[PDB]
Amino acid sequence: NRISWVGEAVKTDGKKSYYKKVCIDAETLEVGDCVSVIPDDSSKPLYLARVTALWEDSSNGQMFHAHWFCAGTDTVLGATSDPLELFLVDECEDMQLSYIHSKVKVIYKAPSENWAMEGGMDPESLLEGDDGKTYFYQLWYDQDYARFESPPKTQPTEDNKFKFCVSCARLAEMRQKEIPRVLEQLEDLDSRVLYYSATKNGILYRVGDGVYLPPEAFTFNIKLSSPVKRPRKEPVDEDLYPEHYRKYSDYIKGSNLDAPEPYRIGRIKEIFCPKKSNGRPNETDIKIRVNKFYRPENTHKSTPASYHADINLLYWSDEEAVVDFKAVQGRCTVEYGEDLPECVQVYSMGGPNRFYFLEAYNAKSKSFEDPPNHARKLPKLRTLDVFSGCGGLSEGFHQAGISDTLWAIEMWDPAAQAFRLNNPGSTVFTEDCNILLKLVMAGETTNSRGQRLPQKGDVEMLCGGPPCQGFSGMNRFNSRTYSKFKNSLVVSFLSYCDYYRPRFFLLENVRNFVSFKRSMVLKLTLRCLVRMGYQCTFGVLQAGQYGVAQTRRRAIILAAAPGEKLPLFPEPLHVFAPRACQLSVVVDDKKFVSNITRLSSGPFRTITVRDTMSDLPEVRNGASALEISYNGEPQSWFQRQLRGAQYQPILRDHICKDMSALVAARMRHIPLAPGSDWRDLPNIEVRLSDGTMARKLRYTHHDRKNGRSSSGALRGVCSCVEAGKACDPAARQFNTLIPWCLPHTGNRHNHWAGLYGRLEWDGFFSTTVTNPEPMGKQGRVLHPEQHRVVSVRECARSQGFPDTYRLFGNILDKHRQVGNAVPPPLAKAIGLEIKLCMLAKA
DNA sequence: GAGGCCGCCTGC
DNA sequence: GCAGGTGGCCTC
Ligand SMILES: CCc1c(C#N)c(S[C@H](C(N)=O)c2ccccc2)nc(N2CCCN(CCO)CC2)c1C#N
Ligand SMILES: Nc1ncnc2c1ncn2[C@@H]1O[C@H](CSCC[C@H](N)C(=O)O)[C@@H](O)[C@H]1O
Ligand SMILES: [Zn+2]
Ligand SMILES: [Zn+2]
């Protein structure tokens, strides 16, 4: 007695009769109108949707199609969202008309044609500002990846326009994109139909193309004896090594024993579908036959064959396998090197997923035969880099070909000088970024040096990593902290974005940026960008997956102006230890991931400490010669890349801190075996290089939790070892080889694992910090063999810096420059994603 | 300026 | 209980 149709039906598709207008009590609804629905739980707020179709079902009565909006508080923004902002989402369903509560007005707030000149909002307007009091949307939202994007431009046909749901259309396109399909048929064999090409996840595969496959897809025919398993830890003299018992965990940080294998690689020989006795092919079960390629490490030459080889070198093999097309992880190029027109280096650097071979491998004879014969630019963005440091981020972007950094802002003079030495075309402001922005906003044209300040329209890309000081805690945010946030460098960096309105924006930070203050810093940062009208997303990347022998997880925020394509995060290139690759983020009990799909493998093997620095000459503790001979050619692929094509007669900055006599003696007594650290130190007297004697540590107290040695000796060094008893300021010992403070507080610091710890050749670096110190928190900084801390050059190599990359200042200045930097290989991978967006703009 | 010293929290 | 993560504040 309320719902009655207006007019007659438009179409009668079976048991549905469609209409264009319906009357509900005193209101009339038409296709395109927006309505509210009460949730089943009356406490929850109203649902909101657009009506895309109206019909009568001959069994279920009056129906409509609801394309739901998403409330801002249901996105990652949460309670920081504008109360009246909605977001488009790909969610819709059929619903009885009786569930409609009321008609509502929803406005599309489009960015203006002058959007890039509308910046200059107060930071209060950025963080807390709202709009006029009516529902509105401006962005589309991806709930799984936390991506805000410009609304899709999907258009209907002249047939479905009367019931066109954009969500239904995009979901149908996504299902079409995912499902594997055969395209062009080649020959009809008795049992199967052969195809020339097939498609999957938007990629075209043809006979002769290379394919990535999971390591589980096939085995190699090579027969091998079982490798010798890791030996059981032998007992030790508890009196001579009193702290060795603290290594009961049997876990080695920086170890590569549990890194996965990289992809199998094959060349498609056949694409085929089984044919029923009917004769039609079964096109839901597509199969491929491939020839297996061997990586050097897959031959009877084990892992050591990978040491010198190019990371994209393969061997042909005549072994074949059949796998499901569904198992293919991606398409790659595998070419015969001698038949390539260019040199292998120009080929290898010209594009992603490029491999080559020269020889073939015979598993049965364990020999290397020769393969059978049946195998055969846009203008750069003007970039402002804020908090530029010595320029690791700018270097990677320049390597990706997208960026000319014309302006850099860096308050610390040594890093600014380093940036200048590497960027002679750039204007480098050695200035507080807060001061510079105030000058520009006041209408100044030059800073106090006479340097021309960038103006609106000059800056097309903005990038930087702003440090966090006062809000790095994980506790709640209060009046003091939030005031400290409103005046923080993060907000200053966002103010640069609001003023200049670049095409692309990148904010990089430590991983914990995503969780600081219960993730409020992240949430407020995303809210600012959305308020400005930017598309944006966030994620966590592991630098080791992009080509360095270093675990370094970093938080990344990417934003793109309206009119641009929002970039994707780059797919991992190198496999890396899975414990170091925890990239997901929880925001208000919701788990967010990035678009990255390579979760378990990748095209290239992991980069190791050996790859990084096996070619550097031996130097001593305190080495200070700034210019020395390399004494030989680069040995690994990684070293060949970082040394460059041009011959380098001189190796620079292979210098080390001059550790004191005691610390030097400790380093000399750290064993070379992998996993060695302070817990392996002998409890002996040692005469030091300056005449000092290093004293023996003696156990003066009882640790019931830790127990007693094999021969009954105590294991405590302080009265604080008792539950309650305070620190006795006389049990502290000095000039001890085993550092007193480590057994003193080791019970609540995981036994200070890694301090005075050696790198291992097969492993990776711990995070490269600004000042390598064996008794710091990241203490695993000893050379694998030499009795010293890693050099400046070795730290720069762990960050993927080219050896030509200039640093400036004393040795602590240079360590700080290197330790603060974004690894160029990570920044290059990000830049190539931005490059795809530049080329795809239309 | 150096070296020693060493809390609090998250995610399992 | 384990592993990682955040460097900085005395004291010389
Ligand atoms: C694991 C090493 C470490 C580290 C490490 N790494 C840190 S980090 C530091 C901090 N104050 O907690 C920090 C936290 C957030 C933002 C910046 C710095 N603190 C530690 N404390 C122990 C007591 C000393 N007390 C002296 C103040 O300097 C600092 C706290 C310790 C330790 N043992
Ligand atoms: N107010 C401020 N204005 C400008 N630079 C600042 C600043 N406060 C700190 N800095 C600088 O900001 C930098 C943060 S580290 C950034 C490293 C850089 N992304 C790279 O890839 O090399 C440091 O070099 C520090 O000196
Ligand atoms: Zn729909
Ligand atoms: Zn004590």
PDB file of C-alpha atoms and ligand atoms in Angstrom, chain A residues 52 65-68 90-94 163-169 171, ligand 3:
ATOM      1  CA  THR A  52      20.964   1.725 -10.685  1.00  0.00           C
ATOM      2  CA  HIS A  65      19.934  -2.577  -7.425  1.00  0.00           C
ATOM      3  CA  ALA A  66      21.915  -0.746  -4.747  1.00  0.00           C
ATOM      4  CA  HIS A  67      25.437   0.478  -5.522  1.00  0.00           C
ATOM      5  CA  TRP A  68      26.713   1.172  -2.008  1.00  0.00           C
ATOM      6  CA  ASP A  90      32.933  -1.729  -5.957  1.00  0.00           C
ATOM      7  CA  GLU A  91      30.147  -3.168  -3.813  1.00  0.00           C
ATOM      8  CA  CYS A  92      26.539  -3.647  -4.892  1.00  0.00           C
ATOM      9  CA  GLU A  93      23.619  -6.043  -4.492  1.00  0.00           C
ATOM     10  CA  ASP A  94      19.970  -6.689  -5.356  1.00  0.00           C
ATOM     11  CA  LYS A 163      20.310  -0.660 -15.566  1.00  0.00           C
ATOM     12  CA  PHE A 164      24.030   0.087 -15.768  1.00  0.00           C
ATOM     13  CA  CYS A 165      25.896  -0.508 -12.501  1.00  0.00           C
ATOM     14  CA  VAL A 166      29.521   0.613 -12.702  1.00  0.00           C
ATOM     15  CA  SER A 167      30.393  -1.755  -9.843  1.00  0.00           C
ATOM     16  CA  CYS A 168      28.889  -4.717 -11.711  1.00  0.00           C
ATOM     17  CA  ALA A 169      30.826  -3.692 -14.838  1.00  0.00           C
ATOM     18  CA  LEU A 171      33.704  -6.662 -11.282  1.00  0.00           C
TER      19      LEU A 171
HETATM   20 ZN    ZN D   3      26.088  -3.782  -9.325  1.00  0.00          ZN
END
